[PDB]
Amino acid sequence: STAGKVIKCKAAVLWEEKKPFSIEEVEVAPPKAHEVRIKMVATGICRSDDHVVSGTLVTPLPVIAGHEAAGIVESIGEGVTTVRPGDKVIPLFTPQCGKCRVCKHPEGNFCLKNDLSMPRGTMQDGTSRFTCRGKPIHHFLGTSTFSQYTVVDEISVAKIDAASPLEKVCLIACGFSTGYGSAVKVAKVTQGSTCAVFGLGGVGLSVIMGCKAAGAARIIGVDINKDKFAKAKEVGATECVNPQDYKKPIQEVLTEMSNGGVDFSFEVIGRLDTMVTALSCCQEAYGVSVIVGVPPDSQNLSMNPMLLLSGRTWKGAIFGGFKSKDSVPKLVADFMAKKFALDPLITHVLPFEKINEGFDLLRSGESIRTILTF
Amino acid sequence: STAGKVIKCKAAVLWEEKKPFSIEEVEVAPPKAHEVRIKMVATGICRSDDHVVSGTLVTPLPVIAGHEAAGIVESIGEGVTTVRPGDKVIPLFTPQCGKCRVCKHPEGNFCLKNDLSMPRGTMQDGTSRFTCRGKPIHHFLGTSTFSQYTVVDEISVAKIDAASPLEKVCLIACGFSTGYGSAVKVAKVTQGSTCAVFGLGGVGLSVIMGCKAAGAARIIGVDINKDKFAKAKEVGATECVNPQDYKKPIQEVLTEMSNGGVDFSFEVIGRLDTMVTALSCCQEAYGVSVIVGVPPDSQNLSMNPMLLLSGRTWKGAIFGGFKSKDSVPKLVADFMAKKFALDPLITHVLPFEKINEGFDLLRSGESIRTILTF
Ligand SMILES: NC(=O)c1ccc[n+]([C@@H]2O[C@H](COP(=O)([O-])OP(=O)([O-])OC[C@H]3O[C@@H](n4cnc5c(N)[nH+]cnc54)[C@H](O)[C@@H]3O)[C@@H](O)[C@H]2O)c1
Ligand SMILES: NC(=O)c1ccc[n+]([C@@H]2O[C@H](COP(=O)([O-])OP(=O)([O-])OC[C@H]3O[C@@H](n4cnc5c(N)[nH+]cnc54)[C@H](O)[C@@H]3O)[C@@H](O)[C@H]2O)c1
Ligand SMILES: OCc1c(F)c(F)c(F)c(F)c1F
Ligand SMILES: OCc1c(F)c(F)c(F)c(F)c1F
Ligand SMILES: [Zn+2]
Ligand SMILES: [Zn+2]
Ligand SMILES: [Zn+2]
Ligand SMILES: [Zn+2]
């Protein structure tokens, strides 16, 4: 048995920015009250994890990163009621405490217990469950999925279907749900509409999926890497454009293509310039633009507010707007019921030990999602 | 008797920025096909007219400004079907052509025939109906209401109730409808919500009226002129704050006052800094901020897109989001049935000949709306 005992296990520790992960032994404390310790099964590599490496996202280091995963409960702390040992679970990088003003709001999902806004890199109680070479190691978003075992707060875990294939449904933990929800929930894409999707990675592809599910008539994929276009068309893009092919700015191109601007645009990259471009390419009176990409830390964009005064709507969201604990189990049920596909997002499957190789595939442009298997 | 003939009449001509209006004779050509010539009865002084004088808003000069007015049709050009001589009418500074993609859209109002985005200062046909000292004079927003007679395109005029009091309902041509609609239509303020309204002039007071009509529980007025607070409370503000009273930035003050951010905020001034402050003070996960104020020409704001990524919605609108020709007659009918009040906005009445005094009253801080009578 491991319950109630420290587990020594393998994890990918990030000791400093812009270096490879170090795959080594860590100690994982048992769960305290209202905590859950999880044996990981599969985790995706999301660009947001790479942002921690690159310094685009600032979070305390050293850290066990990883936030897009699924596993099996090994043990529960006192007072846990929502999962039990042996349950398949998804860690929730956006918690759902159920008690804060946001959780109580019909349209809110960015629970005030989150560790995104002002990251502490700890459990809810302000401490860590991880040590490595005698040193405390920070958590990431209350999840820390790049480890054979993690400990998460109860509000940051959802029980999912016991028959779920974890090597697929781990994508519901971030990139699928984010993109899909950004389209169907946050933008509320309409039937017959024209959409523009900037960035054709795992998240942007999931946005296309959502736009197609919502009945859009046209879905224009935008990426500087034309190798991304074939898969974008496979999941619903009607046209793809590479800004580098044009002498004019792509907002002008998109405005012309859509005979005066698109209905819905999505920024799914993380650049200030493409956030402004994506807003501009939506129709000036009734267009909607949704920011999904994560921009570099502490940088402001510049824009002309006449873009909004004419009638545009500009919004952003975390995790597709989904209230995380309510939504994740239903998303996995819907996957099980064949309501959407995840295989189109999965280009590589590697052992966890090849995490660095997985990141190199992302950075080179060659992968969509690599799934790491423990 | 005047039908088909040039009319000589008095108008307020703006020959140069930052100068008084010149009340002097102009020649008003008869209406061409699908044009309407109107004898003005009353016009308000909106801060946007002052923006033309100050160069905040750039439109070709020399110009006959004025856009918040009502009058009586003197004559119609060939092919006009929607008004007749003797009808009471409101010129529509936002046209409604009824044929463009925006007019056809359920939520659009910024008709593509507008002369706001890239002002030409002409009729729809690219020419002017005004001569002064033998020189052609620009129109403004297709309305040019600072004249005893104007000529407007048919798509820029609405027939209103024959029993309407024109010296009141002129405010439905801009400031009331803009503010009221910004709350009820654009923001869609909810019952029991907390609102913050930046700027307590005629438009911001009309925002407050709309928030109260929508059932808001708290409506916090924000103005640097505390003399504006009493009227704001009369029309529904539950409390008023002056940023100059506080050591801390007002977005922090309002976030504290609202126990974590407001539901709905409105920028009703026209400053880049308050547009960003108003966004920031709405709750980060589900707040909505509406830009109403007109920014200084060609200037960009700077903001951190994390404010949107967490879940905020940022939007703007012209004319409260109302489809102008459909909505203005209904608003007049509702006013006649006492569904809202206009007198709280009217602080001063002057003859048209005293237009400069009316602008002095606005610039000093003393007035909300001065109504000029022809
Ligand atoms: N809001 C959320 O909750 C949330 C969730 C998941 C991911 N993200 C962010 O979403 C973004 C996309 O994530 P991902 O899909 O995993 O990343 P990704 O797989 O790197 O995809 C990004 C795509 O953008 C393309 N691209 C790069 N620069 C440009 C450009 N200038 N113009 C057009 N295309 C360009 C690039 O070729 C790539 O295909 C990242 O910034 C993530 O951090 C946010
Ligand atoms: N979107 C539209 O369709 C539309 C329609 C009508 C008016 N407008 C614009 O809306 C704005 C307000 O018009 P109005 O009500 O006629 O003008 P107004 O009467 O000048 O009211 C503006 C108020 O803002 C206050 N103010 C100025 N600076 C600050 C500050 N830093 N912080 C807080 N309050 C401040 C000021 O004291 C005044 O009471 C102007 O920019 C107009 O051009 C837009
Ligand atoms: O990919 C999801 C994701 C985000 F959307 C963030 F905004 C963020 F800060 C982060 F760390 C993250 F993982
Ligand atoms: O006050 C209404 C109003 C506006 F909202 C503008 F954006 C504008 F350019 C203008 F000239 C105007 F009069
Ligand atoms: Zn919560
Ligand atoms: Zn992610
Ligand atoms: Zn139109
Ligand atoms: Zn106005």
Residue numbers in the entry:
A (entry chain B), B (entry chain A): 1 to 374
Sentences from the paper on this structure:
Horse liver alcohol dehydrogenase catalyzes hydrogen transfer with quantum-mechanical tunneling that involves fast motions in the active site. The catalytic and coenzyme-binding domains are connected by a hinge region that was identified by comparing the structure of the open conformation of the apoenzyme with the closed holoenzyme, where a rotation of about 10° closes the cleft between the domains where the substrates bind. The O atoms of the alcohols are ligated to the catalytic zinc at a distance expected for a zinc alkoxide (1.97 Å) and participate in a low-barrier hydrogen bond (2.52 Å) to the hydroxyl group of Ser48 in the proton-relay system.
The G173A mutant enzyme was also studied because the substitution in the hinge region could affect the conformational change, even though the steady-state kinetic constants are very similar to those for the wild-type enzyme and the X-ray structure shows that the methyl group of Ala173 is accommodated in a pre-existing cavity. In the present study, the temperature dependence of B factors was determined by X-ray crystallography of three ternary complexes of horse liver alcohol dehydrogenase from 25 to 85 K with a helium cryostat and from 100 to 150 K with a nitrogen cryostat. The mounting stems were stabilized with expoxy glue for the G173A ADH crystals, but this did not seem to affect the mosaicity or the B factors as a function of temperature in the different cryostreams. In contrast, crystallization with fluorinated alcohols inhibits the reduction of NAD+ to NADH, and the NAD+ and the alcohols in the complexes are positioned appropriately for direct hydride transfer, with the pro-R hydrogen of the methylene C atom pointing towards C4N of the nicotinamide ring of the coenzyme at a distance of 3.4–3.5 Å. The B factors for the crystals with PFB were larger than those with TFE, suggesting that the crystal quality is a factor. The overall and residual B factors for the protein, C4N of NAD+ and the methylene C atom of the alcohol obtained by TLS refinement are almost temperature independent.
